[PDB]
Design a protein around this ligand. Structure first.
Ligand SMILES: CC(C)(COP(=O)(O)OP(=O)(O)OC[C@H]1O[C@@H](n2cnc3c(N)ncnc32)[C@H](O)[C@@H]1OP(=O)(O)O)[C@@H](O)C(=O)NCCC(=O)NCCS
Ligand SMILES: CC(=O)N[C@@H](CC(=O)O)C(=O)N[P@@](=O)(OCCCN)OC[C@H]1O[C@@H](n2cnc3c(N)ncnc32)[C@H](O)[C@@H]1O
Length: 180
């Protein structure tokens, strides 16, 4: 499979999902910083990304989790730029289940980048038999994330009451799955 390269997973001509590395810390940090105000509306961690050292620490932990298959954290490269992150936040091997996370900088939204990334990951891990069940959880009022889940052919399974806390406030999540 020529799409599986040493540096990452080639999705298409414009998108590669990069294995984390320290060389990305500066660009990743700058991207998060640029999007902090908007990102704080949908995720709990951006509020606390205050220096490049925070992105270094995130990269170091992500590499440890990747090594041990606890998670799969990938940095989305679109053309020449880091565009965001796509992940299996959790890989449950015993139950062949992966829980998916994602974000894109504002300048990279509206381009199908995360939908293409997710489709590629499901082909690679799902059609190979490693993962049987893929899961997306997202706050009910997160319009774009819900649209992405549906665009990727996931099915709504239910609503998880008060399941995600942002800034001390609990929000309901939709839980979506795609089963192989
Ligand atoms: C959720 C998030 C990743 C969605 O980004 P996105 O760009 O809409 O993601 P997709 O890859 O699904 O792209 C779909 C959009 O691209 C358009 N598009 C353009 N080219 C496309 C292609 N090749 N394929 C599919 N869609 C394409 C679609 O029309 C759609 O745009 P629209 O919203 O104007 O209808 C983004 O809003 C984000 O990062 N938000 C903040 C963080 C966050 O909420 N994360 C998830 C927490 S649950
Ligand atoms: C997104 C989605 O579909 N569902 C939701 C809801 C859910 O699953 O509970 C979700 O996963 N939300 P999320 O904010 O938290 C993940 C932990 C859940 N407890 O992660 C979003 C992205 O941010 C990345 N990410 C996390 N920390 C990061 C950091 N410090 N720097 C850069 N990227 C980071 C991460 O790798 C992922 O790709």
């Amino acid at each position: 499979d020529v799409s599986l390269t040493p540096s990452g997973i080639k999705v298409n001509d414009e998108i590669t999902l990069l294995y984390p590395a320290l060389k990305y810390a500066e660009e990743l940090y700058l991207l998060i910083n640029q999007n902090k105000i908007n990102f704080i509306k949908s995720m709990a961690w951006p509020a606390f990304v205050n220096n490049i050292s925070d992105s270094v620490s995130f990269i170091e932990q992500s590499m440890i989790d990747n090594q041990n298959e606890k998670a799969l954290i990938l940095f989305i490269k679109y053309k020449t730029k880091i565009a965001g992150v796509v992940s299996f936040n959790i890989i449950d091997h015993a139950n062949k289940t992966a829980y998916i996370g994602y974000w894109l900088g504002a300048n990279f939204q509206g381009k199908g980048i995360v939908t293409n990334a997710i489709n590629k990951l499901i082909q690679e891990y799902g059609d190979s038999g490693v993962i049987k069940r893929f899961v997306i959880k997202c706050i009910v009022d997160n319009k774009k994330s819900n649209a992405t889940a549906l665009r990727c052919g996931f099915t709504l399974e239910g609503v998880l009451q008060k399941a995600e806390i942002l800034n001390g406030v609990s929000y309901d999540q939709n839980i979506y799955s795609k089963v192989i």
